[PDB]
């Protein structure tokens, strides 16, 4: 995927909603994070009751 | 069930003279009287719902006090018993 | 819904050992420390509440 | 006919308002440093003080962001965090400006009705802690991996659940009824 | 007097039975 | 006269006592009805959900392919 664009020299700086994890930090280098966030559940829900 | 509800009631409590007491305990003058009676009914309904809400309004080893020692609680057991052995092995 | 399950922030990725890592990270950190990050956040996300 | 429907509607309204107020209770405060009140302490009733303990990252940030606020907040607690918390609980201190993690743990552990402001989600300049090591040291590459490898698992999450906890989740009135009766009688 | 206490008692009974029923029938 | 009185007290000698008791019973009934409606009106979680821990065909727990979430899911045991 898009990491091929960085490792294979296609690009030189990956700017995207990139999440920090193990092997990605292993192969390429990161910077200090600019937005903290986690993983969350999205579910459709109907609130009102007639 | 004593003095559990009348906290704000007495504070806000502050031919017509008998009619006011009657409708409290139940031309434009009649319209005003009817509106006042409706307001009193709404007020007493709010009072009963408030008392209902007021009436409507401790865990295992997972308790943070049971996990982080606290001086407000004396979590004591039987000395030299099996519970002491079980507690002696885990880390926290 | 759900409690956050992976509390790792985002990141601006780049090729390993590139000379820009120190400068990119430092500038991102300075802007984040300054009001620039919060300003860019408010005008672009969390601006709607229905 | 009309009266039966009227009493049914009254019953429905009573039940609806009961369930309305029963599942309805929330506490909120000022928006934080974004407010003009925090930007401009000099008001009709100026804030008592702002508890920014010096020699820290908070002091540097607040000095390099709002010099007037930093100068005004000189009435800050010197000794430690606990003294400032006790003083605020008593009432001399108006508001406390400090590190998010320590303040959040203190709120989640300390008893009483003291709560952190709604800026928990809207924390200002969220940077995060770290393990500083010597400049250009070879230890950067392993630790950067290892600690990160801790994060992509249940290790750090469970450890945080273990050490920093306490409950008292940082989430009642009657004068609104008096306001309603005043408005209706008006 | 009597009627005010009567309506207060009726309100208390309604609230009490509501809170009672909120946790019945298992 | 009782035919209109029944409707009136529903919408509100021993004969008067019986009427008063019937009115009280009707009031108790309507109070029970409003409390019933109140109770009826008064009457989804994270990765800890048993469906999210034990696979189930009633739920399609899907994510973005090849994304970071797949990596996070690939390492843990269950
Ligand atoms: C990273 O930032 C530093 C700091 O500005 C850059 O160092 C400067 O480089 C210019 C051009 O070579 C010099 O004129 C300055 O005197 C340097 N200043 C310092 C403090 O070193 C450096 O070039 C930047 N590197 C990259 C890859 O962007
Ligand atoms: C921040 O650091 C300064 C520098 O030491 C502290 O100033 C000292 O304060 C103590 C207690 O009042 C005095 O006995 C020293 O003489 C002071 N030293 C200097 C050089 O002024 C200051 O207290 C610190 N602020 C804190 C801990 O909140």
Tab-separated table of C-alpha atoms and ligand atoms in Angstrom, chain D residues 52-55 76-80, ligand 2:
chain	number	residue	atom	x	y	z
D	52	UNK	CA	0.390	27.501	38.412
D	53	UNK	CA	3.298	26.047	40.382
D	54	UNK	CA	6.482	27.436	38.774
D	55	UNK	CA	9.561	25.588	37.488
D	76	UNK	CA	0.721	30.779	43.014
D	77	UNK	CA	1.307	27.921	45.445
D	78	UNK	CA	5.046	27.398	45.965
D	79	UNK	CA	5.424	24.280	48.187
D	80	UNK	CA	3.643	21.447	46.382
G	2	LIG	C1	11.561	27.469	41.563
G	2	LIG	O1	12.991	27.501	41.670
G	2	LIG	C2	13.492	28.627	42.407
G	2	LIG	C3	14.999	28.564	42.333
G	2	LIG	O2	15.549	27.876	43.448
G	2	LIG	C4	12.957	28.589	43.836
G	2	LIG	O3	13.410	29.742	44.538
G	2	LIG	C5	13.878	29.341	45.842
G	2	LIG	O4	12.805	29.338	46.793
G	2	LIG	C6	13.197	28.925	48.110
G	2	LIG	C7	11.942	28.906	48.950
G	2	LIG	O5	11.263	30.153	48.895
G	2	LIG	C8	14.265	29.868	48.658
G	2	LIG	O6	14.702	29.396	49.927
G	2	LIG	C9	15.444	29.948	47.698
G	2	LIG	O7	16.376	30.924	48.149
G	2	LIG	C10	14.964	30.314	46.297
G	2	LIG	N1	16.077	30.329	45.362
G	2	LIG	C11	16.269	31.307	44.471
G	2	LIG	C12	17.468	31.162	43.585
G	2	LIG	O8	15.507	32.264	44.383
G	2	LIG	C13	11.435	28.546	43.822
G	2	LIG	O9	10.933	28.391	45.144
G	2	LIG	C14	10.943	27.390	42.958
G	2	LIG	N2	9.491	27.388	42.883
G	2	LIG	C15	8.732	26.403	43.374
G	2	LIG	C16	9.464	25.268	44.026
G	2	LIG	O10	7.507	26.426	43.297
